[PDB]
Amino acid sequence: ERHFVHQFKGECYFTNGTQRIRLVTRYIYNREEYLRFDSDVGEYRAVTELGRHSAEYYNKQYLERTRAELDTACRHNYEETEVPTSLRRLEQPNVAISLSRTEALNHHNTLVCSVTDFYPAKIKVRWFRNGQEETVGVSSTQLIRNGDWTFQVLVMLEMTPHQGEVYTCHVEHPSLKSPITVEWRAQ
Amino acid sequence: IEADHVGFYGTTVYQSPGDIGQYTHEFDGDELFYVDLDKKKTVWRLPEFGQLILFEPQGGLQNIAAEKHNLGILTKRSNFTPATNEAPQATVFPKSPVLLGQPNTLICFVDNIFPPVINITWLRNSKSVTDGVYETSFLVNRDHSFHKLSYLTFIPSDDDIYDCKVEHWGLEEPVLKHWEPE
């Protein structure tokens, strides 16, 4: 089956708030970016062939206006719209401890702290064995992005349970005042 | 590229035959919203959103338009060179922990989509299901490919089994990611 596609991407890059903004727009045919505009650069440029003369035209025609969208669009949006929304969003997480496999004989098992539905993504999780920082045995998944503006993440713990032992999953995040702690006992 | 925050403002896509287009805005990697070309309005990813700072939907129609244009022009100039399909790759996982009887959403993450035309569907016990199903607009991947996500709100069941059905011109026969509670 015959098919043809063209895309246009407009990207705004910000470092340290708005005290450093970069703007890049790409014009793509199928998966070929032929033309491009970069603030750092200054003018439209050809990236491939299809864009050879396309460059020369966009400057003659849009250069000015374009160079100006860096504010009307990038700076504006950020300062005017992002601060009150996106950059403000604060979704507290959910913590739950689970067990690798049904009950413990006293063998090698693994506890699954489950930090879910949070946002933004800056977060700190860590286990404890009776108030003691479990240094080794911990491992976690590369943080997951649910796509509905929330993240999740699992922090496992390789351990051998005895009795009277207490395992705590300390969870810290910007959305929370006080860190959530979730205990677990080999009852 | 390095940066603290990154906004995609006006990311527009068009393709034909079919005259199928898309206009969306994403911040720090998420779908702020998209634009419904028919009902011609601003459609967000979350309710809680545009309940204050809105977006003039026309602005989008104006990039889809420009693109329809740029599309043709390029088609010809490239010597009617066709886009190459790809093999979308899906993966399934739960929004929250798995607890029987406790609501949850099943998620199918299909990546490497392209051309931006695919058909994702869910399946419980080898039977198709509808509702409790939401779909994200096609989303841009660095290598100008696409990824989307299908959410199936449901409830664990000791028995029940679910599969994420992925159809695309980039797959001879449908792909099926299976998933069920241990």
Partner: peptide, 14 residues
Amino acid sequence: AMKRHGLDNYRGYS
């Protein structure tokens, strides 16, 4: 109030 702006997609030569 303030509204979100979307980068302008510029047309190519006709």
